[PDB]
Amino acid sequence: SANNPWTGFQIFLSPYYANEVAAAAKQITDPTLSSKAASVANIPTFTWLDSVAKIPDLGTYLASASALGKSTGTKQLVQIVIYDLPDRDCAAKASNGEFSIANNGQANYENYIDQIVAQIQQFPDVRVVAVIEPDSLANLVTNLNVQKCANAKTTYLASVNYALTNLAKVGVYMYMDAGHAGWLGWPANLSPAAQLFTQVWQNAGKSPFIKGLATNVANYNALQAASPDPITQGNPNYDEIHYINALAPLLQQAGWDATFIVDQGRSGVQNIRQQWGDWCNIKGAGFGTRPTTNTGSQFIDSIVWVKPGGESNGTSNSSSPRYDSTCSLPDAAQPAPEAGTWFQAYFQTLVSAANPPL
Numbered sequence: 001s002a003n004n005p006w007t008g009f010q011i012f013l014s015p016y017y018a019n020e021v022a023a024a025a026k027q028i029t030d031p032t033l034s035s036k037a038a039s040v041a042n043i044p045t046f047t048w049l050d051s052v053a054k055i056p057d058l059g060t061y062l063a064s065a066s067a068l069g070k071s072t073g074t075k076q077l078v079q080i081v082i083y084d085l086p087d088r089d090c091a092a093k094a095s096n097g098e099f100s101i102a103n104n105g106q107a108n109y110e111n112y113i114d115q116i117v118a119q120i121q122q123f124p125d126v127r128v129v130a131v132i133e134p135d136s137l138a139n140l141v142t143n144l145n146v147q148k149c150a151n152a153k154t155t156y157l158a159s160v161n162y163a164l165t166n167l168a169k170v171g172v173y174m175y176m177d178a179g180h181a182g183w184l185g186w187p188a189n190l191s192p193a194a195q196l197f198t199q200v201w202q203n204a205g206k207s208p209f210i211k212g213l214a215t216n217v218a219n220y221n222a223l224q225a226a227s228p229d230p231i232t233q234g235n236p237n238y239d240e241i242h243y244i245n246a247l248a249p250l251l252q253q254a255g256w257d258a259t260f261i262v263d264q265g266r267s268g269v270q271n272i273r274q275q276w277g278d279w280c281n282i283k284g285a286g287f288g289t290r291p292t293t294n295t296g297s298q299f300i301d302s303i304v305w306v307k308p309g310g311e312s313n314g315t316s317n318s319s320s321p322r323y324d325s326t327c328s329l330p331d332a333a334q335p336a337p338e339a340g341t342w343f344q345a346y347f348q349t350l351v352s353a354a355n356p357p358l
């Protein structure tokens with residue numbers, strides 16, 4: 001499109017991820033690998049606002065970005081993930097979301113959005129790009145047979161709508177999460193997905209700030225695979241470019257000339273999964289293509305690193321109340337600590353296996 005949110009901006013580098021990376025790098029014993037690991041702190045990632053407790057951090061990042069821009073003559077851009085739906089992750093065996101539909105989820109989520117908007121409103125010289133609710137709308141395409149998802153459908157739609165409508169009022173550029181090629185990219189899922197995303201876009205007023213969709217968030221697919229990963233058999237859309245090329249024209253027909261961003265933060269190593277749906281701490285993952293607007297596609301505004309590499313996707317300990325058995329599969333790195341906590345061995349392998357190399 002004419003307006004790529006990243007062009008002309010300096011991306012703000014997360015100091016939190018930077019702090020995690022710095023602490024991790026000093027524990028890597030091989031000196032050459034340690035220096036490569038430390039440099040990961042210079043690679044832009046998205047900040048996950050996975051609870052209300054993260055909102056004060058957002059405020060600090062906006063204010064810091066505003067000052068860094070003035071100190072360097074740059075316009076700064078802060079990258080965030082909106083990730084706090086009530087009954088979050090409806091199809092997962094376990095979820096860490098703090099809100100529940102049964103306990104005023106809609107009002108609590110609205111207040112979470114209001115607090116985020118109130119921060120963003122104070123720093124108008126900082127641009128914000130937001131990924132909207134990973135692991136939400138995609139469940140409403142394929143997983144309505146999951147009772148928790150069926151029962152969450154109206155709340156997910158209302159809450160996502162509230163986020164889109166209100167973040168647009170402060171000029172946030174937004175990409176709705178849209179799963180990945182092995183979820184919504186199956187040819188038979190493309191039209192139901194397009195119909196749902198279009199309805200969501202319409203309900204939020206077709207705001208020009210709703211730029212399009214984010215794909216492969218927290219996943220491992222290639223953007224453009226050298227050859228199809230065996231997990232993809234049966235799906236001609238075996239990588240993200242095939243998925244996006246197939247979905248984008250369906251959105252165009254609705255009047256939404258959508259553009260896309262694609263997570264490649266853990267895509268450096270292909271052919272590491274037994275089944276396509278295995279998502280938790282996949283063993284042998286490597287850092288992938290660094291964020292760039294040089295995407296190879298008319299539809300793709302940026303390759304991005306949405307999910308921060310090194311933060312555990314979930315514990316492998318079956319005695320934890322947050323245990324999801326996906327995290328103990330044979331292709332999941334184990335033992336793995338609780339979701340969000342640092343997984344040092346996994347980070348070291350992400351560095352060692354990076355492709356392109358760091």
Ligand SMILES: *[C@@H]1O[C@H](CO)[C@@H](O[C@@H]2O[C@H](CO)[C@@H](O)[C@H](O)[C@H]2NC(C)=O)[C@H](O)[C@H]1NC(C)=O
Pocket residue numbers: 317318319320321
């Ligand atoms: C695996 O999960 C279990 C349950 O969460 C953990 O065992 C408990 O740990 C807490 C303190 O961390 C104690 O209050 C409980 O009494 C423990 N229960 C038992 C049966 O030991 C266990 O620590 C976890 N293991 C790892 C490596 O995280």
